[PDB]
């Protein structure tokens, strides 16, 4: 389920990418840069100071072009003594090259380092003459080409994987709006525009698969907004492409943790499927760099961070606290053979996103007893589920899937899941977790209103199906319990009382029933151990409801770990405006204001979700392809409102069915592509 | 002997003879073990004798060093001088063996002679444990070198009649079983840190090889890390165990632990491994704590089959080691005998032990098929199936202890009074199953008394008078046909014992209490006459009716006996009485109901321990569970278990289901007929 920018990456390239992907969302890889170049002097410096060494360290093939390389005093690349030490030792390594070109045609590097420039104030060197055959500029780019693919070779002749971030910061001022003329690329890779540019990228990507480098996981470096949108477009165009780049990286100095989100934020809304770095960070004369615990609970959660040495370096206090905090892995805390790395619920909500109800799919019910799977899975007309609908989703900036499954068709009389039905939920969850998303699995039409619920809010109930629903959820946590925690448990769905009182129940026992049942659920997954001692469960209010009696009633279940238990409740509020309302009004934005200031109200500590919401009102109408303009816009001003606030009140949300629905599904493509238009703007934003 | 089947099914008479000995102990008393001084000596016994006087039962020796060079000529450590292993079992003591499986530090390090160039974990070497699996490794190549080295040293200790305790591979798990999956959680040898699949295929590769190598004088045991100390951060490490078929010990290892801790360790991991023993292969002291007094463990509830401290730092202080080998429940190896085949014990200490009961019910307790008819006749009349080994098989591996077998004898007994042989043979086939599957059982004489037709035992100043002999005539045949078992059968001397009119809840006339103590002097003079195992085997007596009230316990006197400590009183309990007939749920008046019997019980009974020999649904009509009950009532029935079990363990006490759990044809299978209440039960209990 790996797939590299570099198609035949080695088995160590694909292990550290396994590995950050473990990672990314739940812990911030420590980096330092080299002094300078080849060395780790600035990571020995930290290790003197809090006794860890950063998890990274970054080497630059700046200097790759300087004569008498093991005798000049101050520079030879051949020794790789510099890199292999520090992979020997666990470290991760990092590459990056500061092109220096000569600063004309008859200028030789010297020895010392004379002669080079990186610009057209420091050299004639031309981005577009580099390209075309037989050219100075074409010889020099060639040949340290040529010198560094030899140096990685050697590198991965001793097994050292590395990520490698070439030609960064490509756009500099270039996007400035006015176009000003200091509004202009400070490298000269990035002085001829963003074509050239993105054909330097394809050209050292091919000429590095071509020398038979396999061992780099590549990371471009954006500009996004130069800190200022009002000024500046983005670098969208410069973007080498997603077959060409696995790491989005930045380069911050100088910022605030709520400056920090903000670029974080926006990169990963234009680069769905990519991770997203902190490439570069460190202090300027005006300001020092946040905290980086702080940035993190801000929401800038980057894969890695790397303060620049010198002047940029941060001081020893800060280094100080960023070693010892708990979200920052150091070099001794790597764990590249790792399957699982336990995440708090509220570090799981956060890392949601947009969130999509796969629908009518496993849920669908009433065929009877012993048919084949697919009958099940198509019996509401939905198609059957593939991998690329999750790929859709991740690709389209969707972070989590929620899929319902009803089980009781597929249990027999002892209560023993059907085992072709569990492997068809089973290869479903492995879809969702290939293509990065976090996924949900449940408890479904057990419950509610149907003819075949049998999990009920009544005393009566309880008593003579608790056995069968325990027994439902161990086979269930046995059965998923080798998913890493991108798989979460959700007890039951909508659980009513024997009469399928839908506000409240009409006896105050049936809270307790409801209770004891998510105790009984929480219980029997932790019971299994492994990964399920510490996955994120999620428990649902009476009915899914959110009225002042539900919750006061709601009772969190007992958990022996902390902070991962979730809870989840619907919204289709206002009830029925797709049917009565003309637009979304204020009174359809004041009800949802007050849905989550009660929420937020209740649960402090404890994470909640919009477990599903849209247009369903009354006899099952909703919004299709084919609903008026003015309807469709009451669809997406809906959604737009519900990813915001979820956003501001640190919840998240799962779209039911409507904008990625059966034959759509098959394309794949959007059902309703304005309402997922406004979702991704309010969420981005 | 015959009935012994080690985790090596080819394990020669030596091996079997030393199980069955740790069998009769485990338990009953601890056998005190010591460390050698780092490898292959018994010179911290030696010590322990200078200072107590007594040797430790057990030596434990290492192959920490089996790879150094030049053994016979470097001066310090030589494996093939068998010497200090086979003088310590020359002497009588039991011999323990484990390895510090030691590597080379790299693939071009060559241990030297000294013992330079080895390390055990990835700290000290890059010896990777998956890669010693692999033929064609600098690993594995080692690995088996250094297998056959330990090897061949077993089987010169074989040769000369040793047997062992062999803990392999010890604390594999490490810190890896935490929960959160921090890398300051791992394994510190070795073995461990390739993970628990791997590891297990260490295990298995050990136990085939040693095994094809002719190897049978082992008894393996596998250490534990239990949670390491702490479930609400670790796992447990179950997905590390070699299996039932690989291992025949738990062992755990604990520094600077108190009593109560040690016994939390000892029931989780007899709850978890219920047909296997339990071991503290190492303790000692720590830097801020003592380990505990062995006494004071034992007697919190840590029953540990052996203790052995380590050696250095960790050995206890002198102060310690005289009061434990002066305890009366530590064995010192001048109290060792393999050759018992009795131990005595107390009272409480077997209560203690029954753990969960069950009862064997409507099958040797059948009866009304008349006289002179096959013994499969009598035991198949009332719907159960002839009872086998693998019914008390099951029991054992599904974490019961103890089994009451009820037996009615009228039928049996000719006009003298004689027991009929075949009769009798068929209880001691049915005793022997029971022993054999390791469990307590209790022989009783049943509806010999109570409401039916051919009961003749009353509670009745005339019906005693008539009846007495022929009592006694009938004990002292149960006692002499059944004298040889040891102290894990039981004796009952009779079940519900009512007066001549059949009264359930009090004898009409309180000269009936004067009959019922009658018979229970009786029983128990009958029974110690017969000597030998009989003169100290625990017997249990039963109240009027079994019953609990007030009036009955007040003229409930229990017999004289000639021994102290060796009886135990039994009542019965359906209370609330027809609770599965006119209740829904298992609510606080059902609760109630019991906790006032416990303490009325545990007032009238201190020293004298008390069981519940039978309790269940069965209500009026005699209505009950069944698999096929509705769910809630199912959970009624669970709900009950669940409180009884766990009220009888709180008051020093135990309890014995009557039948519904392993009824009928699930008993051939074998498998529960009740799962839930079964589980209901054994949570109730171990936690």
Not at 64 to 80: E, F, H, L, T
Not at 292 to 298: D, F, I
């Amino acid at each position: 389920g790996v797939f590299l920018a570099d198609a035949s990456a080695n088995d160590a390239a694909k292990k550290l990418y396994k590995y950050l992907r473990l990672v990314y969302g739940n812990k911030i890889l420590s980096g330092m840069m080299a002094h300078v170049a080849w060395n780790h002097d600035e990571a020995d410096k930290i290790h003197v100071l809090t006794g860890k060494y950063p998890a990274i360290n970054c080497y630059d093939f700046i200097h790759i072009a300087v004569p008498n390389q093991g005798s000049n005093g101050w520079i030879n690349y051949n020794d790789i003594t510099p890199v292999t030490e520090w992979a020997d030792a666990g470290g991760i390594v990092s590459l990056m090259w500061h092109f220096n070109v000569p600063q004309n045609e008859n200028t030789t590097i010297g020895a010392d380092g004379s002669g080079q420039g990186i610009n057209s104030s420091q050299t004639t060197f031309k981005a577009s003459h580099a390209l075309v055959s037989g050219t100075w500029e074409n010889k020099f780019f060639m040949e340290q080409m040529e010198n560094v693919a030899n140096v990685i070779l050697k590198l991965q002749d001793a097994g050292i994987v590395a990520l490698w971030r070439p030609f960064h910061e490509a756009a500099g001022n270039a996007t400035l709006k006015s176009g000003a003329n200091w509004g202009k690329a400070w490298f000269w890779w990035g002085e001829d525009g963003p074509d050239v540019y993105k054909q330097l990228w394809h050209t050292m990507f091919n000429y590095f698969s071509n020398k038979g480098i396999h061992n780099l996981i590549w990371e471009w470096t954006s500009q996004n907004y130069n800190g200022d949108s009002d000024i500046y477009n983005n670098d969208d165009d410069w973007y080498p492409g997603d077959a060409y780049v696995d790491i989005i990286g930045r380069d911050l100095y100088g910022t605030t943790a709520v400056q920090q989100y903000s670029e974080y934020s926006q990169l990963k809304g234009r680069y769905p499927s990519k991770m997203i770095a902190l490439a570069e960070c460190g202090v300027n004369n005006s300001t020092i760099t946040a905290d980086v615990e702080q940035a993190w609970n801000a929401g800038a959660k980057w894969l890695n961070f790397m303060p620049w040495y010198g002047e940029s370096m941060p001081s020893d206090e800060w280094w100080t606290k960023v070693m010892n905090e708990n979200v920052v892995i150091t070099r001794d805390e790597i764990n590249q053979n790792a399957t699982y790395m336990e995440e708090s619920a509220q570090s799981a909500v956060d890392n949601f996103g947009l969130g999509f109800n796969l629908g009518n799919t496993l849920d669908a019910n009433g065929c009877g007893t012993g048919k084949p799977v697919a009958t099940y899975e198509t019996f509401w007309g939905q198609p059957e589920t593939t991998q690329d609908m999750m790929t859709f989703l991740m690709q389209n900036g969707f972070n989590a899937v929620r899929i319902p499954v009803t089980w009781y068709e597929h249990m027999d009389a002892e209560g023993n899941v059907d085992e072709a039905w569990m492997m068809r939920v089973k290869a479903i969850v492995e879809y969702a977790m290939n293509a990065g998303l976090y996924a949900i699995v449940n408890v479904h039409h057990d419950t509610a209103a149907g003819s075949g619920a049998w999990i009920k809010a009544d005393t009566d109930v309880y008593a003579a199906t608790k056995e069968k629903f325990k027994k439902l959820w161990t086979q269930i946590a046995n059965a998923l319990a080798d998913y890493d925690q991108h798989l979460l448990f959700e007890g039951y769905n909508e659980m009513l009382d024997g009469n399928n009182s839908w506000d409240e129940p009409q006896k105050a026992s049936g809270y307790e029933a409801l209770n004891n049942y998510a105790q009984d659920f929480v219980d029997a997954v932790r019971a299994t151990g492994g990964n399920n001692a510490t996955r994120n469960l999620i428990v649902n209010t009476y009915a899914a409801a959110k009225g002042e009696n539900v919750l006061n009633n709601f009772m969190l279940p007992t958990d022996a770990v902390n902070n991962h238990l979730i809870v989840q409740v619907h919204s289709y509020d206002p009830w029925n405006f797709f049917n009565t309302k003309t637009t979304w009004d204020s009174e359809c934005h004041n009800t949802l204001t007050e849905i989550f200031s009660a929420l937020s109200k209740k649960f402090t500590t404890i994470p909640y979700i919009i477990g599903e919401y849209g247009t369903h009102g009354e006899s099952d109408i909703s919004v299709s392809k084919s609903s008026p303009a003015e309807k469709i816009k009451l669809a997406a001003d809906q959604a737009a409102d519900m990813v915001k606030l979820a956003k501001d009140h640190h919840s998240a949300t799962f779209y039911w069915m409507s904008i990625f629905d059966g034959s759509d599904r098959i394309q794949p493509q959007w059902s309703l592509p304005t309402v997922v238009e406004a979702m991704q703007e309010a969420y981005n934003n």
